[PDB]
Amino acid sequence: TADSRKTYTLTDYLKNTYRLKLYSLRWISDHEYLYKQENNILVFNAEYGNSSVFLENGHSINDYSISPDGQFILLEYNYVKQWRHSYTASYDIYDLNKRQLITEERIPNNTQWVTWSPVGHKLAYVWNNDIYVKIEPNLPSYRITWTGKEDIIYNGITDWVYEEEVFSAYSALWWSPNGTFLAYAQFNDTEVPLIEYSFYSDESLQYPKTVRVPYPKAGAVNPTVKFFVVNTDSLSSVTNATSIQITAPASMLIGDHYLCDVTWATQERISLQWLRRIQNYSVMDICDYDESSGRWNCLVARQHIEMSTTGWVGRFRPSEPHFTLDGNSFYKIISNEEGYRHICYFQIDKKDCTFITKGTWEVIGIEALTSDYLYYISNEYKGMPGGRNLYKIQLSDYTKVTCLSCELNPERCQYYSVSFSKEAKYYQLRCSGPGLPLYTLHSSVNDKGLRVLEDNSALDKMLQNVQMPSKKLDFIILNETKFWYQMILPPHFDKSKKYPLLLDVYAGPCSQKADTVFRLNWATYLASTENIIVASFDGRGSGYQGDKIMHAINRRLGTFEVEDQIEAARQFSKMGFVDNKRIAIWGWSYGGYVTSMVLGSGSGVFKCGIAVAPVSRWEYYDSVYTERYMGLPTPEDNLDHYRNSTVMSRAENFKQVEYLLIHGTADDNVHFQQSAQISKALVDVGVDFQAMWYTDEDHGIASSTAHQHIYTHMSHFIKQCFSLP
Amino acid sequence: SRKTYTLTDYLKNTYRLKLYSLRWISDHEYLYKQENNILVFNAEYGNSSVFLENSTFDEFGHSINDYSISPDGQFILLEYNYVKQWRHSYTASYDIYDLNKRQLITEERIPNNTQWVTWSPVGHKLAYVWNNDIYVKIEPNLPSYRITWTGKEDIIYNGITDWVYEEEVFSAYSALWWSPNGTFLAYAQFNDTEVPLIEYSFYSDESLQYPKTVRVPYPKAGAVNPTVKFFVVNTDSLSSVTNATSIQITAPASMLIGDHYLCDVTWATQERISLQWLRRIQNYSVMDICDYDESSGRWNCLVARQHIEMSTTGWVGRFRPSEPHFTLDGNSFYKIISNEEGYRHICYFQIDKKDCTFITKGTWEVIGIEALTSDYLYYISNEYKGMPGGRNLYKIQLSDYTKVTCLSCELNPERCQYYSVSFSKEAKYYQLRCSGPGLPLYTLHSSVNDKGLRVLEDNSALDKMLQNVQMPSKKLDFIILNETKFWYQMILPPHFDKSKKYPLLLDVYAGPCSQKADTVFRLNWATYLASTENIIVASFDGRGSGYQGDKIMHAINRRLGTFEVEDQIEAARQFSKMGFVDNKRIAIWGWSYGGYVTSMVLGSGSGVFKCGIAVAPVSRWEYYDSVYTERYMGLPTPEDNLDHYRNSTVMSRAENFKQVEYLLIHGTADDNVHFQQSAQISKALVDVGVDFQAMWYTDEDHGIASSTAHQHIYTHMSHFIKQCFSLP
Ligand SMILES: *[C@@H]1O[C@H](CO)[C@@H](O)[C@H](O)[C@H]1NC(C)=O
Ligand SMILES: *[C@@H]1O[C@H](CO)[C@@H](O)[C@H](O)[C@H]1NC(C)=O
Ligand SMILES: *[C@@H]1O[C@H](CO)[C@@H](O)[C@H](O)[C@H]1NC(C)=O
Ligand SMILES: *[C@@H]1O[C@H](CO)[C@@H](O)[C@H](O)[C@H]1NC(C)=O
């Protein structure tokens, strides 16, 4: 009479047998959007529901991109991945009057970035590290920049560290809304040291190649930045156009520093956010074009400073300013007196700022700013850090708070994100759990529910045939403070049996792993098929619960986060249904670091662990991330905690545990170096362990074949550790 | 019951073999280090005195790695700051102590980053290499004379080898040869300008923030090789007012027509030198004999004195052309050469005649010529009892070479079947070294009447320790497959029941030229496996091992990864049907060429092997070096042998690994078999969805021989095997 449905199996996960539909769409105006219906790209109506085929069923096309004036379309193909965001591609442009490929002045192959202007059909592209502007797809490119040099000078695109860590994007250029100006950044990596690693390629390659990338590790030379802006409107200087530099404020010129972002606030006002390499001080420069000359006016009474007292500035970087349409006001998320991030309103002419939200909860992002409302996401509802809901607040009197999503579907839906059309006339709401993802469309006017876009009924019906695990989300209180955790529980869970326990850890700063999101992943398999409980715990300083929790780790990575994982397992351990002799832990990247530090703790709580692409020593990781939390590796600053918080210093304690260490050899992010040094430390101390390298894989180990292999291999390891035939 | 031989005993050298390492300094005396200081011994009577007391307060301030006494006993050279490079390559600091006073030499010292130093064969001249250039000192306390000016890191090598010449050709770092006197210094120059680099990462100390890329000129199969020149200097010509002049000797035109190697150089007299050259298609070698012309300063290589070596069945020599052994007069020499039925025997040559007379014959092989006097030749062979894995010393009369005496065969027939020998100057005395199958035994003899003089070391101390350990036994025997017998050994666990069912590890190497079944006493990993874990460790010599004639050896010519692999499987099969072996628990492992075989075996689909360990395997011959690879495989081109290069990769057999448990191990700083090779294996297994185990050892080279890594790799392999064999 026991349940005899199939379980959710490893093959299920790897083959993606059970598909989550995500209804991915792209707004193209205020009332119409783009959606791929299987083989076709449809255009839809927001007001109603009429759709029409836009493009229906040699070159595999990676993406299509239409100009804001509807007259041309770009398609990229021959797509070749670089780093996380960076790519090269070929581009051809077609007409939108006569669906015909433009034959003449064609964008070069090996182009690195392309972008329409916000209006009209202007195009700027980056190729061999220099910026080019096409006045029209048929006419000739104008060369804006002549300094570009492989691995040395980057114009209009980022170098490695700016791509991964500060911009989270490859693009380093910014059209004015007019289309008049084109702003761009220039990066100089001349003195940045290179990470070099072997790349083995196809078996046919007789000698291995070595990849060389400018990559500043903690306390190494950082690249330098310059900011320029060019007038594309009138630039009759066809051979040599004239670029106008805006310097950082003298506040920044005292040492090395970063450009964090640029925002055009109006047609002739641009905002620059700079940050010192000691990332506890950031300045906002407001710069105004003066038509009498060709200069810009930054440094004045318009500077807005942000200092961090108990940590660093922002979560992963200073918050983005949102400007009014007549932009001499802007809204920005800022940590307040009690240490919770809320929205402050700014006036551009001096003054401080005025908060318009408050409470023991955090605004995560401002999603849209209209002439009458500000929309934002927060975890206010039900006091649940792991929840996310859409809110709107009235502009003039900001007391008026409506939640747009909270009560839509409170059982199924506790984790919302949003996508607004042009002018925020409509929005797609995206519910990511704990139910099956639910995707709805709304009009802002009365924010009425128009339609349900996707309800994942299909998946739901399939899953009825499968023994699926449940997820429990709750909290424990260690010394005065609630700390949240989640458990993935085997089907037909029986609190009178003993189950093995896998702690899934990331535990990096700014981070959150106990949440309300629905996932089908490796944990799903472990719970369903192998009857393993998979838990996650957010300790000090996980994110989204105030600075007192988040900043607890400042200048002291690999202490309190590791501590809290241990004693979380101890508490989990005390409940009757957890087998104390079969507790394990695994994690990736920062999670690999914490796993390794836990296993080397000597705690005696954990039987075994798996570390995938771990950091091992903070001097090995990039300057922007680690220096944010760790300061600089010098005697004068924080060298001392840099040295006592390596994995290698704890190798002796690994004698007690079964350890599995995995790393891709072409990891450009966390370098194979880091695991190479862990293994050497373990060897030197006489500790046995298991290892696996993945040839030519990077940080994601994300090739279809490698993806399957790694999870297969980890499943074998876990099962043997827990004595599961 | 008694204690077993445990893994720790192997790793910690608990039970040590004692050696007796001596250095003949004359025709009747040898040096020997006893505990701390250096003794000099009279061979006839065995009495000794102190040559150098236990007082390194001459340096005192540096700990000495090694040292070297000048031939005339006047000086001692000590090295410190020893820094390993490749297999034989290293760099060091050096001081010279003048033994006939008390003081070290302080002015005109040997520079601190020196790459190689050697005394002359007599007297106390010195030649050394520093920044890739050769220097000579006529006296330790006189200034150095610079001989070469072209030296350039990683590009021009004077007096020292580049990678491929060090590893594969000379088997040494040195590329200089003093004449016997020695008035002349001969040296080779290597030019690696157009040789592609192998690049790999070196991670170094934890404190190194950025990994460094190591770049080494290394010719892979069918790439641009280094070129060589050869010179000789008249050292007696160096004076305060006289420059160094380096006379070139050019290769013969039969070599100059294409790519070629310098194989070896042998001084025949104080005025006569032999050089062996080898074509890159290694089917053809030429030996030149060159005479010094007094009033010219030239070296004359008469065409009439050339001798050429060709093969049909295969390549020339075992790993290289054999060495010539010249008579005192220098007008004749003896060389080991393959005969009509493919057996290596001693041929006698006159330097001006092409036709050579064989003076030994039989279905066995001469391994080496050890000594030549005016009346006898001494050599080692495996003739005795028809056992290819035994070695005995014989002597043969030069006149009636039909008169042969075996000098070691019957000295101790049960305990001693594997000998090597060290003769004195002019061969008045010799030390016999017995290496198995019993405990090592060292003896001294007089050549006069092959009288035994005394036992030097009998390892009595080790035997008595070993009486309290459960030691395994060694069985050496053969099977016959078709027309031929093939030899194997088994390490047998103590208490060995021939009806009970034992798990079997096949220990394999099986590279060309090689031998894994023999008479040697070893304390190793297999000893622990047998003694502690009760596992039988077998090895098998198939096609094309030595030392059993060209018929067996050349069988894999141009076909690496075929018959070698077949024969290991067959061997396991014939072991299988023994009542004392469990066919459900057969494993295989090997290192280097042995890792390749292991891998090709496991990927075979044989069904024989449950599991397997490959340590630093070759996976694809295009990845390995020109000299070794092309010897057996020719060139990777359509017109030659590319078809089989492509047919003999481990990667091609990836899908067949589904059925076995595979552990793949490789050091990341392997300069010899590059990590690339295992990296391609792993990728091919990944791409085919085959699970396996892996281990890298960062910064370890081909031998994985660092103290801690050695310990780690063996305990890791032991865990793997035991779990394979359901042992623990
Ligand atoms: C309905 O939407 C389609 C999609 O583009 C559009 O073409 C059509 O004009 C819409 N219908 C009306 C009457 O607006
Ligand atoms: C980049 O910086 C280097 C080193 O300071 C300098 O020589 C060079 O002029 C800079 N390049 C540009 C285009 O600014
Ligand atoms: C050994 O004794 C012999 C015979 O008395 C003597 O001639 C010789 O000097 C001694 N050798 C040494 C090195 O002690
Ligand atoms: C080394 O060979 C190159 C040819 O590639 C040549 O240019 C150079 O002169 C050679 N060096 C010597 C010392 O002959």
Q: What is the 3-state secondary structure (H, E, C) of A671-702?
A: CHHHHHHHHHHHHHHCCCCEEEEECCCCCCCC
At residue A165, the 3 state secondary structure works out as helix
Picking from A14, A192, A203, A682 by the largest number of B CB atoms within 10 A of its own CB, the best residue to mutate is: A203
Query: Which one of the listed residues B592, B599, B682, B718 is annotated catalytic?
Result: B592
Cα dihedral sign, B676-B680-B681-B685: positive
* Closest Cβ opposite residue B696 in set A198, A679, A709: A679
Per DSSP, which regions of B150-259 are E strands? 156-158, 176-178, 184-191, 197-202, 212-217, 227-234, 246-248
CB atoms inside a 10 Å sphere around CB B9: 18
How many residues are there in chain B?
728
Residue nearest to atom 7 of ligand 4 (CA): B193
**What fold does the segment set A468-725 form as a domain?**
Rossmann fold (3.40.50)
Q: Mutate which of B191, B195, B246 to test ligand 4's pocket (most atoms within 8 Å of Cβ)?
A: B191
Q: Which CATH superfamily is domain A4-467 in?
A: Dipeptidylpeptidase IV, N-terminal domain (2.140.10.30)
Answer yes or no: is the C-beta of B446 below 6 A from any ligand 4 atom.
no
* Closest Cβ opposite residue B708 in set A683, A695, A716: A683
Secondary structure (DSSP) of A238-289: SSS---EE-PPPHHHHTS-EEEEEEEEEETTEEEEEEEESSTTEEEEEEEEE
- Please report, as a single letter, which amino acid is at residue A552: A
Answer yes or no: is the C-beta of A190 below 6 A from any ligand 2 atom.
yes
CATH 3.40.50.1820 in chain A, residue ranges? 468-725
How many residues are there in chain A?
725
Q: What residues of chain A lie within 8 A of the CB of B623, using their CB?
A: 206
Is CATH 3.30.300.100 the classification given to domain B471-728? no
Count Cβ atoms within 10 A of the Cβ of residue A660 and give its class: 0-12 exposed, 13-18 middle, 19 or more buried.
buried
Q: What residues of chain A lie within 8 A of the CB of B696, using their CB?
A: 676, 679, 691, 693
Under 8 Å between Cβ of B691 and A712: yes
Q: Which residues contact B408 (CB under 8 A, 6 or more apart)?
A: B392, B393, B416, B419, B432, B434
Enumerate the active-site residues of A.
Answer: 589, 667, 699
Count Cβ atoms within 10 A of the Cβ of residue A575 and give its class: 0-12 exposed, 13-18 middle, 19 or more buried.
exposed
Nearest Cα residue in chain A from B708: A684
B679/A200 Cβ within 8 A: yes
Under 8 Å between Cβ of A345 and A363: no
Residue nearest to atom 7 of ligand 3 (CA): B42
Q: Tokens for A453, please give them.
A: 């876009």
What is the Cα gyration radius of chain B?
27
B715/A688 Cβ within 8 A: yes
Secondary structure (DSSP) of A427-452: EEEEE-SBSS-EEEEEETTTTEEEEE
Q: Which residues contact A448 (CB under 8 A, 6 or more apart)?
A: A442
Q: Say how far apart CA B569 and CA B583 lie, in whole Å.
A: 12
- Shortest distance between the Cα of A252 and any Cα of chain B, in A, equals 28
Q: What residues of chain B lie within 8 A of the CB of A685, using their CB?
A: 708
DSSP state of B391: B
Backbone angles phi, psi at A359, to 5 degrees: 145, 170
At residue A218, the 3 state secondary structure works out as coil
Q: Say how far apart CA B573 and CA B563 lie, in whole Å.
A: 15
Under 8 Å between Cβ of A648 and A678: yes
- Shortest distance between the Cα of A637 and any Cα of chain B, in A, equals 18
Q: At CB < 8 A and 24+ separation, what contacts does B10-14 make?
A: B10/B523, B10/B524, B10/B525, B10/B527, B10/B528, B10/B714, B11/B710, B11/B711, B11/B714, B11/B715
Q: How was this one solved?
A: X-ray
A220/B198 Cβ within 8 A: no
DSSP state of A422: G
A688/B719 Cβ within 8 A: yes
C-alpha dist (Å) from residue A462 to A22, A100, A524: 17, 44, 15
Q: Say how far apart CA A569 and CA B512 lie, in whole Å.
A: 57
Nearest Cα residue in chain A from B685: A709
Under 8 Å between Cβ of B465 and B450: no
CB atoms inside a 10 Å sphere around CB A17: 13
Identify which of B96, B218, B242 has the alpha carbon closest to the alpha carbon of residue B165.
Answer: B218
Q: What residues of chain B lie within 8 A of the CB of A619, using their CB?
A: 209
- Shortest distance between the Cα of A208 and any Cα of chain B, in A, equals 7
Give the containing element (helix H, strand E) for B254.
helix B253-256
Distance B203 CA to ligand 3 centre (A): 55
Identify which of B228, B227, B232, B317 has the alpha carbon closest to the alpha carbon of residue B273.
Answer: B232
Is the peptide bond prior to B182 cis by the omega test (within 30 degrees of 0)?
Answer: yes
Q: What residues of chain B lie within 8 A of the CB of A712, using their CB?
A: 689, 691
- Burial code of B430-463, b = ≥16 C-beta within 10 A, e = fewer? bbbbbbbbbbbbbbbbbbeeeeeeeebbbbeebe
Distance A191 CA to ligand 2 centre (A): 9
Q: Which residues pair with B612 in a beta bridge?
A: B588, B662
Backbone break loci in chain A, preceding residues, C–N > 2.5 A:
57
Q: Which residues pair with B275 in a beta bridge?
A: B265, B288
At residue B214, the 3 state secondary structure works out as strand
CA B520, B521, B526, B527: dihedral to nearest 10 degrees?
Answer: 170
End-to-end Cα distance, chain A: 24
DSSP state of A620: G
Nearest Cα residue in chain B from A214: B210
- Please report, as a single letter, which amino acid is at residue B601: V
Query: Which one of the listed residues B670, B671, B678, B682 is annotated catalytic?
Result: B670
- Shortest distance between the Cα of B637 and any Cα of chain A, in A, equals 13
CA A595: distance to chain centroid?
22
C-alpha dist (Å) from residue A210 to A135, A200, B213, B217, B676: 40, 9, 8, 15, 12
Q: Say how far apart CA A167 and CA A259 lie, in whole Å.
A: 9
Q: Say how far apart CA B657 and CA B685 lie, in whole Å.
A: 8
C-alpha dist (Å) from residue B247 to A229, B174, B467: 69, 19, 62
Backbone angles phi, psi at A37, to 5 degrees: -95, 90
* Closest Cβ opposite residue B698 in set A193, A209, A680: A680
CATH 3.40.50.1820 in chain B, residue ranges? 471-728
Count Cβ atoms within 10 A of the Cβ of residue B269 and give its class: 0-12 exposed, 13-18 middle, 19 or more buried.
middle
CATH 2.140.10.30 in chain A, residue ranges? 4-467
**What fold does the segment set B1-470 form as a domain?**
Methanol Dehydrogenase; Chain A (2.140.10)
Under 8 Å between Cβ of B402 and B420: no
Question: Residue A48: nearest ligand to its CA?
Answer: 1
DSSP state of B236: G
Identify which of B153, B156, B119, B152 has the alpha carbon closest to the alpha carbon of residue B138.
Answer: B119
Q: Tokens for A179, please give them.
A: 């289309």
Q: Does the annotation mark B307 as catalytic?
A: no
DSSP state of B111: P
Under 8 Å between Cβ of A667 and A193: no
Nearest Cα residue in chain A from B720: A690
Q: Say how far apart CA A515 and CA A504 lie, in whole Å.
A: 13
Q: Say how far apart CA A229 and CA A578 lie, in whole Å.
A: 61
Count Cβ atoms within 10 A of the Cβ of residue A103 and give its class: 0-12 exposed, 13-18 middle, 19 or more buried.
exposed
- 3 state SS for A629-669: HHCCCCCCCCHHHHHHCCCHHHHHHHHHCEEEEEEECCCCC
Nearest Cα residue in chain A from B623: A206
Q: Mutate which of B132, B189, B193, B228 to test ligand 4's pocket (most atoms within 8 Å of Cβ)?
A: B193
